[PDB]
Amino acid sequence: HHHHHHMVHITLDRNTANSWLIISKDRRQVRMGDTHQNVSDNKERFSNYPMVLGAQRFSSGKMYWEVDVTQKEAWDLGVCRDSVQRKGQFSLSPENGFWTIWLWQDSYEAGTSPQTTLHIQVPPCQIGIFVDYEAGVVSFYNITDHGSLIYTFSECVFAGPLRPFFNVGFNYSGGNAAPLKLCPL
Numbered sequence: 001h002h003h004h005h006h007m008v009h010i011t012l013d014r015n016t017a018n019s020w021l022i023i024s025k026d027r028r029q030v031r032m033g034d035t036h037q038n039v040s041d042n043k044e045r046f047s048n049y050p051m052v053l054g055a056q057r058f059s060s061g062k063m064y065w066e067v068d069v070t071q072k073e074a075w076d077l078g079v080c081r082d083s084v085q086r087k088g089q090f091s092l093s094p095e096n097g098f099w100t101i102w103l104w105q106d107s108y109e110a111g112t113s114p115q116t117t118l119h120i121q122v123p124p125c126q127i128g129i130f131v132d133y134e135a136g137v138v139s140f141y142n143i144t145d146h147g148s149l150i151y152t153f154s155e156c157v158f159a160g161p162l163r164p165f166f167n168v169g170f171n172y173s174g175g176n177a178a179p180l181k182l183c184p185l
């Protein structure tokens, strides 16, 4: 692809983070802690899952960023509306304000309703995310495989400002401790 010149510097918003997440000083990395991280609760924190939002809000234009997922067994990535549900159980779907892909149990899937199987020959170590607000597009790219296309959501009805969206996943197996990292431009 040729989306790299729309690169944006994303940082994580601590106030939205599940209370078990550890965000680095530079707000560019996040991982699952082994316990509650000693923060007060608030109406913005994701309660049920190890999720966090980017600080940046997008309402126009073209945006691109990259995320490192090296040696993770489970994660979700994409964008979401600023007004997505934070508390309780919910599915990741465009109806609920999410445009995401994930890894789970050795398969990759797009967060449509119902979910869509992805066809990835080269397991990615870094994912590129492109948003075209005006066109209603969210696309995902396999940076490990020379930028090959993973998935495009088109005809998106964003219906609000968008925020970068992350889920580091649970670590029940002991094999999913590794962080999500925002990669440098």
Ligand SMILES: C[C@H](Oc1ccc(-c2ccccc2)cc1)C(=O)O
Residues within 6 Å of the ligand: 070, 071, 177, 178, 179
């Ligand atoms: C307690 C903490 O545990 C970590 C465990 C794993 C990783 C990691 C980093 C890059 C790629 C894959 C895994 C980082 C931290 C530490 O040792 O600081």
